[PDB]
Amino acid sequence: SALFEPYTLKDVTLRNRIAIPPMCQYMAEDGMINDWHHVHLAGLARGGAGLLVVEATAVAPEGRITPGCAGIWSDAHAQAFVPVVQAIKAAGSVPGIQIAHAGRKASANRPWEGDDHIAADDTRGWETIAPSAIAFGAHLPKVPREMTLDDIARVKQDFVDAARRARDAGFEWIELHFAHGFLGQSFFSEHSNKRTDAYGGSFDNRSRFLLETLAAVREVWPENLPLTARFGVLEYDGRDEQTLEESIELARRFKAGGLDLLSVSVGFTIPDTNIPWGPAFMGPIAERVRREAKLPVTSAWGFGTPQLAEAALQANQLDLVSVGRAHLADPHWAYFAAKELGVEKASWTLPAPYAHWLER
Template sequence: MSTLFDPFTLKDVTLRNRIAASPMCQYSAVDGMPNDWHRVHVPALARGGAGLVIVEATAVSPEGRITPGCTGLWNDAQAEALAAVAREIEAAGSVPGIQIGHAGRKASANRPWEGDDHIAADDPRGWETIAPSAIAYGGGLPKVPRAMTKADIDRVRGDFVAAAKRARDAGFKWLTLHFAHGYLAQ
């Protein structure tokens, strides 16, 4: 157990200990914009002593959000708001990290407490989903996504690159890519 509290260095990033606060979706953003909830809650994890605090799965594009309440990093205003979160994490002694991703066929879903299923087709809060193939995820996510074209692949790849650059410029020192449990991998 003694190594748990020892510093850990990876390349030029040193964590004060080996405790990491994993990215946890908050579903509290509006139009991808982090707000006071994020500026208070996420840095509190750093004040709790974690060596690394990773901001929730953050969409690289509007259609890449899991839900309407997910944070985004597809524009400079979002990057500026997330920079404030990164500064607070760092001020509390932790390394600021962020997870970026694209929900693919699992996008356009309701928040968990609203049903955790796809937003109805006639609901204006929803959006078109994309995936490598036009096959629904299944279960409570029955929406059939549009199969991606080569142009879609190029655009989404560019969205990941742009979001990663915005994250770096916003002060995040650790980046994870969300490619798990059915999300779009690049």
């Protein structure tokens, strides 16, 4: 099975091609993770996936999505990850982390607590920042503050500090969150970036925040550990071909700047879109980016059956298959997939205290 072939990137070898993508848990307190995250992540790692990427972890307090988001904006925050990293490694999975800044989509309620911008008089809320003072709209109506050049310098340094902390906590894989309408994505998109300084207007200027952040992170992140990013390559906003062409050009510049793999997603920059959700719907677009930028990729949003996953790999659409919600339903999804694909000794996807009893 392609799904169960190992994958090597830089000095890191994954035991199979199943990746667990970052999935916010909304269970942290002032950015500090706790036993929710410890058990959640260690349990997933034991389930058999080759790579486990920790949820969007804010580089600064105002870059959380919600009051429940994880953070890594101080050394105390980073140290809270150390036992979890150690538990993920003990299970034989590779520990990764997504470092993030929510931009204009920050200061929101948890998804089961309204999913909307926090009310102005709620003591939990805060001012958001963005390239330009323009609201997302819909359920996120708060107008963000337009960043100064000093804000841009500060947030870049926060990404550097976050990467340094992730390194020193023992993570073996990092992902810069430049997708999903958050700060990085919003610098790239003309919908959200109306700046007329060096960080807006032209393709080079809109790209600048992302490329400078990548380069700054590259200075502290070890050259022997994968350096990756998530990026929304189209919006489904009626501008898809032009947007995909620019996104591919940016992917080429990421590769030239030391990016080892790109997680290909949708932008979610604005609400007025028509995303054609369906099984493996991102496969052809991931494949195009992989081919035209000559860069390894993963994607998600509907690959969560063993057959979809296997087919995407065999077609060389993807290098790793990210499987999210299926792992919330069943932390041992990788074992389920091994059985379904007829892998020999499928139960030994799991550790011995489970595998011995499940051998059929």
